[PDB]
Symmetry: C12
Subunit: 63 residues, 12 copies
Amino acid sequence: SDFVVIKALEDGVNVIGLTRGADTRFHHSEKLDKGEVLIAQFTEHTSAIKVRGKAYIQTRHGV
Amino acid sequence: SDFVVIKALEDGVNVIGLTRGADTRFHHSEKLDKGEVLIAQFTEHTSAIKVRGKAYIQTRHGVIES
Amino acid sequence: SDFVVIKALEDGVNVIGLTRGADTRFHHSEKLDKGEVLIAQFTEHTSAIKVRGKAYIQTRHGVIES
Amino acid sequence: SDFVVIKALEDGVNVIGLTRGADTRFHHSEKLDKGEVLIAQFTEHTSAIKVRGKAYIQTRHGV
Amino acid sequence: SDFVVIKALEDGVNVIGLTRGADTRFHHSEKLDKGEVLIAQFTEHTSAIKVRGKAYIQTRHGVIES
Amino acid sequence: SDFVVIKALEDGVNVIGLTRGADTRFHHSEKLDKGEVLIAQFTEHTSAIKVRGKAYIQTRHGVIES
Amino acid sequence: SDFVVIKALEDGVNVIGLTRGADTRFHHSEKLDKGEVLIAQFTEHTSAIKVRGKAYIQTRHGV
Amino acid sequence: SDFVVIKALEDGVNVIGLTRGADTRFHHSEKLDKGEVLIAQFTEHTSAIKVRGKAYIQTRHGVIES
Amino acid sequence: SDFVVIKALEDGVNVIGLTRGADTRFHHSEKLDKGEVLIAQFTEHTSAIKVRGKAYIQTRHGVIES
Amino acid sequence: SDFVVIKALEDGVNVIGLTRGADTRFHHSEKLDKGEVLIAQFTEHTSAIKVRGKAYIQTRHGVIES
Amino acid sequence: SDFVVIKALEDGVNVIGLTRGADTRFHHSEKLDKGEVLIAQFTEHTSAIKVRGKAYIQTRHGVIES
Amino acid sequence: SDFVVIKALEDGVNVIGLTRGADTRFHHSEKLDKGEVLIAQFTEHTSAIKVRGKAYIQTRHGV
Ligand SMILES: N[C@@H](Cc1c[nH]c2ccccc12)C(=O)O
Ligand SMILES: N[C@@H](Cc1c[nH]c2ccccc12)C(=O)O
Ligand SMILES: N[C@@H](Cc1c[nH]c2ccccc12)C(=O)O
Ligand SMILES: N[C@@H](Cc1c[nH]c2ccccc12)C(=O)O
Ligand SMILES: N[C@@H](Cc1c[nH]c2ccccc12)C(=O)O
Ligand SMILES: N[C@@H](Cc1c[nH]c2ccccc12)C(=O)O
Ligand SMILES: N[C@@H](Cc1c[nH]c2ccccc12)C(=O)O
Ligand SMILES: N[C@@H](Cc1c[nH]c2ccccc12)C(=O)O
Ligand SMILES: N[C@@H](Cc1c[nH]c2ccccc12)C(=O)O
Ligand SMILES: N[C@@H](Cc1c[nH]c2ccccc12)C(=O)O
Ligand SMILES: N[C@@H](Cc1c[nH]c2ccccc12)C(=O)O
Ligand SMILES: N[C@@H](Cc1c[nH]c2ccccc12)C(=O)O
């Protein structure tokens, strides 16, 4: 499945997973400190991801 | 599944999901402040996405930057 | 599924979904004001999409702008 | 499924859908005024499309 | 499904569908006047297409222009 | 399915379908006069196609003209 | 399915289909006169094709 | 399945697997000392991977180093 | 299915099919005189092909010419 | 299935398989002396691979050489 | 299925099939004299192929000659 | 299925097949003398291959 790479460029970057389904709420926010990397898939439970905070982001489409 | 990347270029950007099915209504609006990024799929419940406000948008087709 | 990207180049653009099946009528018209973007799939209910008004459009086939 | 993009270059362009099946008749003609765009798929009901009137047309094969 | 694009370069162009199956007969002829375009699929009922008259033809294989 | 494009370069070209199966005979010959085009698939009933007469032919493998 | 294009460069070119199965015999030979073209698939009944006589031949691999 | 390559550029790098499903918690942290490499898949149990510490990382999307 | 093209560069070329299965024996030898061409598939009954004599051979991997 | 190539650039290289499933433990360590090569798949039992020691590593993503 | 092309560069080359399954033994050795070619698949019965003697070999991975 | 090409550059190269499953042991070692080539697949029984001895090796990833 499709996935996103997020590298935090400041402390306190929040990678926010939004619920798949008729309803949309955040079910999880993963905090990254500067330099940390999250590689996160879309899944049965997560159909949108929001990134709040300065970050270098890669997807299938580019940076 | 296909997905869209939206980066807000100003405060107050709204990304709106439109319901899949015979009927079409807004089911969710996600607000983005300047520099926030939303990576959103098309899904069982969302078959169209509307973006209001200055934004950099990427899909499989390429890029559109306000 | 195949999808279309529509960016309105003026106020009051309309993106219209036409019904899939033996019958063909408009089932929804989404209005876009200048700079607003709609990313819209073909679906179980929508098998043709009509754009009225000055728009920049992207599909798998390329770009069409004015 | 395969689809066609039609941009009308004059008023009154007719995008004509022909019935899939043993019989061939038009079941729908969608009129486009100048500058309007139709993006239309081939479907269970439509296996040929005729465009009458000046138009810029894109398919999988080109313009 | 595979499809052919035919643009008439003169009046009186005919695009003819030949029946799929053990037997081969013309089942439909669509007339095109100069500049009209037909985009036609191969289908359950059509396994060959004949074009008579001056025409620009595109398939997956490339182009043939009268 | 695989298909062949045949453009007649003279009058009286024949495009012949040979039967699929343990037996092989001609089941149809389509005549093409100069400039006429046939786009013909391989099918449940046709597993070889013979072209007689000066023709420009395109397949997935390329072009063959004279 | 895979197919071969044979263009005869002399009269009397024979395109020979060999039987698919435990046994190998020719079941059909299609004669081509000079300039004639056969486009022939591999099939349930034909798993090898022999061409006897001067011919220009195209397959998936080239000429 | 998709996989990530992580090379530690300092001692004490941690590669953390986050649980797949409605709940999200860390289920494993693998420590890597300088020069050590982990090649890790996404799996039935792991749907996000977090890297803490200076690392060179490769995925299908490219490289990310520091 | 994968296939091999063999063109004989001299008289007396033999193309030999080896049986698919636990046992391996020659089940057929086709003779080619100079300039004759055999296009042969791998099949339910043939899992290896041996060519003896000067020949030009093409497969998916490329060409070998004696 | 995806696989990794590891060539040891010094003696004492260890390639360690980590168990697939809810739990993560080392299930095997293969030692490589200088110049030995291991080509290892991801499998029903192995969903992550750890390499300790100076090594040249190749995956689908590219190469990492100590 | 994957296949290998072997051209003998000297007399007495042997192409050996090793058995697929829990056990591994030689089930067939095909002798090739200089210039002879074997095109051999991997199969239900053969999961490794050994070549002894000076040979030019082609696989999906490229060429190996001497 | 994926496969490896091994060409021995010395006598006594050992191409070692490791068992697929929860347990990892070698089930077979195929010896190659200098110049001999083994082309070996991954299989139901073999999920890792170790090559001991100087060898030129090709896989899907390169040499
Ligand atoms: N348990 C979550 C983990 C996750 C994956 N991608 C994410 C993106 C953001 C937040 C959490 C996640 C899930 O399987 O969906
Ligand atoms: N709950 C929504 C989440 C979502 C995905 N893509 C979106 C685009 C816009 C708004 C919401 C969404 C869904 O699964 O469909
Ligand atoms: N409810 C509509 C939403 C939609 C998708 N694409 C469209 C194009 C135009 C208008 C509406 C739509 C549907 O699922 O079909
Ligand atoms: N109801 C029609 C809509 C349509 C799709 N493509 C068309 C082309 C021309 C005219 C109408 C159409 C159908 O589903 O087939
Ligand atoms: N009713 C015809 C329509 C058609 C498709 N392709 C054609 C080509 C020529 C003539 C008619 C057609 C069919 O479904 O087969
Ligand atoms: N009825 C024929 C039509 C046909 C297709 N390809 C052909 C080539 C030659 C002659 C006839 C045909 C069929 O379905 O097979
Ligand atoms: N009836 C034969 C026709 C054929 C196809 N390819 C051929 C090649 C050579 C000779 C005959 C054929 C078959 O279906 O197999
Ligand atoms: N009857 C043989 C025909 C054949 C195909 N490929 C071959 C190669 C060599 C010799 C014979 C053949 C078979 O189906 O297998
Ligand atoms: N037992 C874990 C192993 C694993 C794979 N990828 C990981 C990434 C991080 C931590 C552990 C892992 C699993 O199968 O999911
Ligand atoms: N009967 C053997 C034939 C074979 C195919 N590839 C080989 C390689 C070497 C030796 C024999 C073979 C089989 O089907 O497996
Ligand atoms: N019988 C073994 C043969 C084999 C294939 N690849 C190997 C690699 C190394 C050693 C033996 C093998 C198997 O099918 O798995
Ligand atoms: N028995 C192990 C063999 C293995 C494959 N890849 C590995 C990587 C590291 C260690 C062991 C392995 C398995 O099938 O999973």
